[PDB]
Paper text:
A combination of SDS-PAGE, N-terminal sequencing and cDNA library screening, have shown that H-gal-GP is composed primarily of families of two aspartyl proteases (PEPs 1 or 2), four metalloproteases (MEPs 1, 2, 3 or 4) and several cysteine proteinases (CPs). H-gal-GP is a multi-enzyme protease complex that digests the Haemonchus blood meal.
The final reconstruction of H-gal-GP at 4.5 Å global resolution was extracted from approximately 60% of the particles by classification with masking of the core base region. The reconstruction revealed that H-gal-GP has, to the best of our knowledge, a novel architecture, a central base with two ‘wings’ and an archway, giving rise to a cavity in the middle of the complex. The base has a series of channels connecting to the central cavity. The proposed active sites of PEP1 protrude into the central cavity of the complex whose dimensions are large enough to accommodate hemoglobin (Hb) or albumin. The architecture accommodates a sequential digestion pathway, facilitating positioning of products from initial digestion for subsequent digestion by the next enzyme in the pathway.
Numbering used by the authors:
A (entry chain G): 9 to 65, 70 to 86, 95 to 109, 125 to 137, 159 to 193, 203 to 211, 216 to 221, 229 to 238, ...
B (entry chain B): 176, 186 to 202, 208 to 285, 294 to 342, 352 to 360, 370 to 388, 398 to 429, 461 to 544, ...
C (entry chain A): 270 to 288, 294 to 334, 350 to 361, 374 to 393, 399 to 420
Amino acid sequence: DPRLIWPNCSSLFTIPDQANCGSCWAVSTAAAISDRLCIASKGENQVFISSADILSCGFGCDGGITFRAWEYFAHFEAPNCCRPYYFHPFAQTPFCRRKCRISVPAIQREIMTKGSVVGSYDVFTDFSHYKSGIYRHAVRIIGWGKDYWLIAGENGYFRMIRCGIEQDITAGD
Amino acid sequence: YVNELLQYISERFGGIPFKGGCELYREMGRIEQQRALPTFMYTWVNVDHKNVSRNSYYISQPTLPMPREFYVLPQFAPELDARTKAIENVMKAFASYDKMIKTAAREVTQIEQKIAMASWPDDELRNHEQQYNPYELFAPSEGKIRFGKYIAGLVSPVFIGDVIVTNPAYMGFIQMNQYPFVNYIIVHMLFEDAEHLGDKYLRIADARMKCVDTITTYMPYGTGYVYVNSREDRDQVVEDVKQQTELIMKTFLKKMLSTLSWMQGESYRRAEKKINEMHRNYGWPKKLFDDYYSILEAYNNKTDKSYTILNILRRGYENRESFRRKNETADRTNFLESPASVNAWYAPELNSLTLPFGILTSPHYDLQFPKAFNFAGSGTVGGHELVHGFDDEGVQFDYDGSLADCSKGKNGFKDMAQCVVTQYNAQCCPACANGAHTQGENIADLGGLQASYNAYKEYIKMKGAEEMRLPGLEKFTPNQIFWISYGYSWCAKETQSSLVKHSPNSCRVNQVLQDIPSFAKDFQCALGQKMYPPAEQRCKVW
Amino acid sequence: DARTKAIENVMKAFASDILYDKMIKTAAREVTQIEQKIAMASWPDDELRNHEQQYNPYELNIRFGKYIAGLMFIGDVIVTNPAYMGFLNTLFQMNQYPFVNYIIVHMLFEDAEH
């Protein structure tokens, strides 16, 4: 678990903020980018970044591309952050607005070195039927346990055994 | 009690010199709720016009900085240059390129025109019956290109609740044209927040006076409560003015069908009743005097001397207060404005007659003064306003607040008004003041005063003793001094620049004095004189 | 309302020919308040002097159909009332019924004596 590894930061412990949106992968990519950025000084600079802003800045709520989101680099209506989500937790797509408003073995190895990352999948209805435990037949991975991988439903978390769940990740910076 | 902070505010868009297509409103809504700075909409929010049990939005055209749509008839616009200079901040703000700045100044005008030529000049803005257009984001989305995304600028909302685009004239609308907006908008924001800027630009504009007044329209009830529950015995003046007004309103009712001409039987009975079911309010709200509960009304307003942030905050409140009012239920004891402005008001949207303690005072009034006065002052203004609820505006809203065209009689009414029209139209003050425009308030000039006289008559006759000429001067009459006092209220040396920049006073006195021949007589002076006309003696509209 | 009365009376005198004796008494109010909209957005006169203004050009605002065909790479059609020629755009399959309702009654009203 990365929460026990680094308790300083409080980014991992989060959920989504978009009742009717199709940018789940984008929101997960922004959350995973903040988790990988926390490894820099072990969470010393544990701050959030425009997630929803950068997402819009697929067709927003009609497909996704984690890889593209990572290459693009180079909370629910929170006043703390400069830019926040646009979905008052059957919706419209938002435009750009840069105006601060006030190999499973190699995968686990890279996940233990860098940190959490995005995890593309088919996203079937079976997953929704699941509640807790080693569930089986987009989201981001957290860590591993006993063998299965963690993801974030079951109070945010939703672990699965190790439909292209471990298939679709790369890196960049 | 410089620029950087609000600079970030400005840099919340991008500025003039040298982008994906922004929801100009979102910018607006922000700027409104954060500064109370109306552009692309003045939007006051309250009681529905014609289904009232509720509240609503009145999204509407702005009210232009340059007073009057004067974006049509003479080219007397140097705001061009009250603009360049008052926008020269930048190359003193953060820069070092004028040609831009100029052309863009001309432009922030040229749009302005392209607005005024699409609002409704007041003449058309009588018959609210056609203002009223209930729409909900469903229908605008069908009507236009953003409303929804706007309204977040203004606490679970009532987006669905009946909103009204009073003026469904929105002229429907690019690089060199889009950002002209953001210019204009920012032109404006800074244009009336230069104060917080460095002491330099404030130039382009008494200490306690200006200050307390800013308050006097911002945290209204505060200063009110201070005044009232500070300096006088509420019970006393309130209990007087109760019966005083009541006298007026009464005899005013007596000015009814029985009195009146252009009216008719049932039109009477109704409008009569409109009075009958109509409300008072004096000084304090019904609240304001377990003495905190006012400090509940104005509760939220954080206090921290621990001014830039201050003002901005306080405006944030004044309006935020205005709108937390939105989603609760509609009353009919609305206190429009801060009970220290010396004027009544009567919001025919709902129906109400509130008068401010701040008027329960000098020349408008006093406790132990001759009654000629306490009818010419508090008395007058009482009536002076009350009239409205029979103007060609009052007719619209019923007794209870709705649209049923209360009264045919109309034709009579308008025709008779045309007398008033010409009257003001042929007697110039300066060297004019065309009448057709100000008709309405002009009529009330008469109505109120007419009543307040007829009352004072009645009252004094009931005793028959007050006459008792005045010590400072025997010469005058227990009666004349009435007119003298009324026409003393408006004693106002309007300096002449201000005169050329309601109606102009000297007119109001002279004219509306003509038309009450009762005067012409009771002031001893021969008739055939340029205060009193012959047989068409008086545009007897009351 | 005189305009009203006359409108309904035109389409009435029309109703002589059959080649529903009340609904006219609605179509009337329709086209009337249509007048009212047109006017209440159109431009009154005096303000028709800023030739400076009424010149903004447009070539090839939204709701348009060729419609030039119905008159007979064109130059820039110039539109003398951004205000007006917008206001049509906010005023547009049901529409056809009361909107064509108007153009008839108008065209009719043209040559009554004939």
